From a paper:
Here, we identified the HLA-A24-high binding, immunodominant epitopes in SARS-CoV-2 spike region that can be recognized by seasonal coronavirus-specific CD8+ T cells from HLA-A24+ UHDs. Furthermore, to elucidate the molecular basis of cross-reactive TCRα/β recognition between SARS-CoV-2 and seasonal coronaviruses, we examined the structure of SARS-CoV-2 peptides and the relevant peptides of seasonal coronaviruses bound to the HLA-A*24:02 molecule. The crystal structures of HLA-A*24:02 and three peptides, namely, SARS-CoV-2, 229E, and HKU1, were determined. Overall, we found that the potential of cross-reactivity may depend on the interaction between TCR and the structure of specific HLA, i.e., HLA- A*24:02.
In these two patients with HM, cross-reactivity of CD8+ T cells was also found to be preserved. The CD8+ T cell lines responded to betacoronaviruses (SARS-CoV-1, MERS, HKU-1, and OC43), with 83–100% responders, and to alphacoronaviruses (NL63 and 229E), with 58.3–66.7% responders. The 9-mer peptides were identified at the equivalent position of the HLA-A*24:02 structure. Although electron densities of the peptide backbones were observed, those of some side chains were poor, particularly, Lys4 for three peptides, Trp5 and 7 for CoV2 and 229E, and Pro6 for HKU1. The conformation of these peptide backbones overlapped well. Of the nine positions, the side chains at positions P2, P3, P6, and P9 were involved in the HLA-A*24:02•peptide interactions at the bottom of the binding pocket. In contrast, the side chains at positions P1, P4, P5, P7, and P8 were directed to the solvent region and oriented differently in the complex structures. Thus, these side chains are expected to directly interact with TCR. The side chains at positions P1/P4/P5 and P7/P8 can interact with the loop moieties of TCRα and TCRβ, respectively.
Numbering used by the authors:
A (entry chain B): -3 to 99
B (entry chain A): 1 to 274
C (entry chain C): 1 to 9
Write the structure that this text describes.
């Protein structure tokens, strides 16, 4: 029952600090520029949904589009892979964006 | 420089899945400091920045009463808007409100705002003179006529020039160690080969505050306006922000490009070269 | 400080 001009979320998955294996960090998924505000966001570790993930309070930008930050503490390693999964009315299927230490 | 206070509220209906949800957040500049969530258990305005926790119990009582009243008003406003537009109850609709004020370095009032959006599009907005309204469509003109008859703009003008400015000035003093800071961007460049004929040069800005920043790429002093990839400025989670810009460069031409960084924490803009 | 007044559209 979406209403108004739909805008697809822009998704970024990244760490708070440059990654160093064995060093505690935060894994972030920032979703922005979307409408309507109904959205599902998860952080994944090796393809599996991470349980203790926090998120910011829904807010929006000058153009009225919404943004949210999902985040969890994590200690990266050389082998472990991480990703963000997003579902939104504008997406035909959930979108999974893998974490790349260089983005 | 100048400073701003903003409150942002979102009301969303969810037909068949419960009553509408109301969420409000308050910001000074790019720092959130309160929230209210109609779904949450506390049913209180809650602190979200260290420097607001020193407010006494009657602050929290008063702020809770004001925001809960707004929550109820905007829930009824979703109903009214449905009627104005003759829209079906089956659809999920959104009502957003923004209000707040700007002050200068000396604390003087610079601008006030009080505006609404329905389903993501302008609905009605208080004009800069704080005396008149801009109505976006025929439904909002019904509202405009109603608010003109009830002299709503007079009350909002009084809030914006009075209470709003007083609170912002006080928050800036109470959180001065944190709100009156500028963290300049830490900058660097990375290089990522694509094929054997092309590679990506990425120019990075990290750890900066406030979030406003400009990153641009040039080739031989000429701007690369259309061949640059620029991501949205993003929170680090610790009160600072991050951003990068990237250009695709033919292999061997890296040294033709320069990245340029403007930020209010930099006494002079930067030029980076690979 | 939150607005002291909301109003119906």
């Amino acid at each position: 029952g979406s209403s108004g001009i739909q805008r697809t979320p822009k998704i970024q998955v990244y760490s708070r600090h440059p990654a160093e294996n064995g060093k505690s960090n935060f894994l972030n998924c920032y979703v922005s520029g979307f409408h309507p505000s109904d959205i599902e966001v998860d952080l994944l570790k090796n393809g599996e949904r991470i349980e203790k993930v926090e998120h910011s309070d829904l807010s929006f930008s000058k153009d009225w589009s919404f943004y949210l930050l999902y985040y969890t503490e994590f200690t990266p390693t050389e082998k472990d892979e991480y990703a963000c999964r997003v579902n939104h009315v504008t997406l035909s299927q959930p979108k999974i964006v893998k974490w790349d230490r260089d983005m | 420089g100048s400073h701003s206070m903003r409150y942002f509220s979102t009301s969303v209906s969810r037909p068949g899945r419960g009553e509408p949800r109301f969420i409000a957040v308050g910001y000074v500049d790019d720092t959130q400091f309160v929230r209210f969530d109609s779904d949450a258990a506390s049913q209180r305005m809650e602190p979200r920045a260290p420097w607001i926790e020193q407010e006494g119990p009657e602050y929290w009582d008063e702020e809770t009463g004001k925001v809960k009243a707004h929550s109820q008003t905007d829930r009824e406003n979703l109903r009214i808007a449905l009627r104005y537009y003759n829209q079906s109850e089956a659809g999920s609709h959104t009502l957003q409100m923004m209000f707040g004020c700007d002050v200068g370095s000396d604390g003087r009032f610079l601008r006030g705002y009080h505006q609404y959006a329905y389903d993501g599009k302008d609905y009605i907005a208080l004009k800069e003179d704080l005396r008149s309204w801009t109505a976006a469509d025929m439904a909002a003109q019904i509202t405009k006529r109603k608010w003109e008859a009830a002299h709503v703009a007079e009350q909002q003008r009084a809030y914006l020039e009075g209470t709003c400015v007083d609170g912002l000035r006080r928050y800036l003093e109470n959180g001065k160690e944190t709100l009156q800071r500028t963290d300049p961007p830490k900058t660097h460049m990375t290089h990522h080969p694509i094929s054997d004929h092309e590679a990506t040069l990425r120019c990075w800005a990290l750890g900066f505050y406030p979030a406003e920043i400009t990153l641009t790429w040039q080739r031989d002093g000429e701007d690369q306006t259309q061949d640059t990839e620029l991501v949205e400025t993003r929170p680090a989670g610790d009160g600072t922000f991050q951003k990068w810009a990237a250009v695709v460069v033919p292999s061997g031409e890296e040294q033709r490009y320069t990245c340029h960084v403007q930020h209010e924490g930099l006494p002079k803009p930067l030029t980076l070269r690979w | 400080t939150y607005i002291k007044w909301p109003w119906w559209v």
